[PDB]
Ligand binder design. Structure first.
Ligand SMILES: *[C@@H]1O[C@H](CO)[C@@H](O[C@@H]2O[C@H](CO)[C@@H](O)[C@H](O)[C@H]2NC(C)=O)[C@H](O)[C@H]1NC(C)=O
Ligand SMILES: *[C@@H]1O[C@H](CO)[C@@H](O[C@@H]2O[C@H](CO)[C@@H](O)[C@H](O)[C@H]2NC(C)=O)[C@H](O)[C@H]1NC(C)=O
Lengths: 11, 49, 17, 17
C-alpha cells in the first residue's frame, strides 16, 4: 500500500 | 447393401474415442511474469524468475 | 567479490515524497 | 498557479508474478 498526492497545473 | 427403385439399405462403421478423466480443475488463473529492473555498474538490466 | 543488491518487490520501501 | 492534487494508489506484486 502507498497513497500519494500528484500536483497538476491550474493556471 | 441394397438398391431397388422403391427400397434401399445402408451400413455405417463409426469408431469412438472416450477420454476417461482422472481429475477436473474449474477455477484457474494464467501466470504473467513481469520481473524487476536493476541498474548495475552503469548498465540497466531486466531480471526474471 | 563484494555483496550485490537485494530485491523484494516492496513498493512502500521505495516511496519518494 | 493554483494548488490542485490528484490521488494515486499503488500496490506490490510478490515475486513479480
Ligand atoms: C515493506 O516496506 C515497508 C516500509 O519499509 C515496511 O513497513 C514498515 O515496517 C516497519 C516494521 O518492520 C515499521 O516500523 C514501519 O512503520 C513500517 N513503515 C510503513 C511506512 O508502513 C514493511 O514491513 C515492508 N515489508 C512488507 C512485507 O510489507
Ligand atoms: C481526488 O483526491 C483529491 C486529493 O488530493 C481530492 O482533493 C481534495 O478536494 C477537495 C474539494 O472537494 C479540497 O477541499 C481538498 O483540499 C482536496 N484535498 C487535498 C488537496 O488533499 C479531490 O477532490 C478528489 N477528486 C475527485 C474527483 O474525487
Amino acid at each position: 500500500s502507498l497513497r500519494m498526492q500528484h500536483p497538476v497545473p491550474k493556471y | 447393401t441394397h438398391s431397388s427403385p422403391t427400397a434401399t439399405a445402408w451400413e455405417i462403421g463409426l469408431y469412438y474415442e472416450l477420454v476417461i478423466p482422472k481429475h477436473i480443475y474449474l477455477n484457474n488463473w494464467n501466470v504473467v511474469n513481469i520481473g524487476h529492473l536493476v541498474k548495475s555498474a552503469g548498465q540497466l538490466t531486466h531480471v526474471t524468475i | 567479490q563484494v555483496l550485490g543488491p537485494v530485491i523484494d518487490w516492496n513498493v512502500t520501501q521505495r516511496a519518494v515524497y | 498557479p493554483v494548488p490542485k492534487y490528484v490521488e494515486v494508489n499503488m500496490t506490490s506484486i510478490p515475486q513479480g508474478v
